[PDB]
């Protein structure tokens, strides 16, 4: 379940960090990358608590 959740968008336009990165300007990609970061931190924290 932890390895999966790297394929989840969490609301961004893509789960591939580079695709977001190489397909938008910095100020617009920052929000998407922050959304991915928040989702992945939440997943890792859930794993650690369990």
């Amino acid at each position: 379940t932890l390895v999966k959740q790297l394929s989840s968008n969490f609301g961004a336009i893509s789960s591939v960090l580079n695709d977001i990165l190489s397909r938008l300007d910095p100020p617009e990609a920052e929000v998407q990358i922050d959304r991915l970061i928040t989702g992945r931190l939440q997943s890792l924290q859930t794993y650690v608590t369990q």
């Binding site: 580079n18 695709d19 990165l21 190489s22």
Partner: protein, 199 residues
């Protein structure tokens, strides 16, 4: 590969109206239209938008917001044979000015008198076409000029024509940013034993 066009110095005119000429290999489009014909040198000005004239009004018109290129060069070598290359024609009189990108191939007799001649040729009843008298001794203002117009259109359909793309490699034990046909990433590239199916 527009390169072979825009750096030749063999063209008497290479003018683009919505895209930089030297920057054509990067911008890309959904459809391209290569229109082609032959005119006289003094007449080339009229293959451009806005202006008025015989071709501008009766043979071939460009919209005021044209997004393509015009490429014209002499062909006195090819067309004017010895005593006349009357192969080419043009419209002299027409009832109304052509709309942009409209082709009229009719041979209706133009009427300027008070009575429809209806198949009779005479005063104020003229054949709609006149032929170019290309001879190699004429002045370049009258000599043949091959003209090609490259119009570019960006429809919603999947873009099809795009310019060439460069390429480089650095394979083993190097941390590299890499772009394989749109698959972008960062990492070290190593030879593999995997067996991907052909597609």
């Amino acid at each position: 590969d527009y390169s072979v066009l825009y750096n030749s110095a063999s063209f008497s005119t290479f003018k683009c109206y919505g895209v930089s000429p030297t920057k054509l290999n990067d911008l890309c489009f959904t459809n391209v239209y290569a229109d082609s014909f032959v005119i006289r040198g003094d007449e080339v000005r009229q293959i451009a938008p806005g202006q008025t004239g015989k071709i501008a009004d009766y043979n071939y018109k460009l919209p005021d917001d044209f997004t393509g290129c015009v490429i014209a060069w002499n062909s006195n070598n090819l067309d004017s044979k010895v005593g006349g290359n009357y192969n080419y024609l043009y419209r002299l009189f027409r009832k109304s000015n052509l709309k942009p990108f409209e082709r009229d191939i009719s041979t209706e007799i133009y009427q300027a008198g008070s009575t429809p001649c209806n198949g009779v040729e005479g005063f104020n009843c003229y054949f709609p076409l006149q032929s170019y008298g290309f001879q190699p001794t004429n002045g370049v203002g009258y000599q043949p000029y091959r003209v090609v117009v490259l119009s570019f259109e960006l429809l919603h359909a999947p873009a099809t024509v795009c310019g060439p793309k460069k390429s480089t490699n650095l394979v083993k034990n190097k941390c590299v940013n890499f772009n394989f046909n749109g698959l972008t990433g960062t990492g070290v590239l190593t030879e593999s034993n995997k067996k991907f199916l052909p597609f």
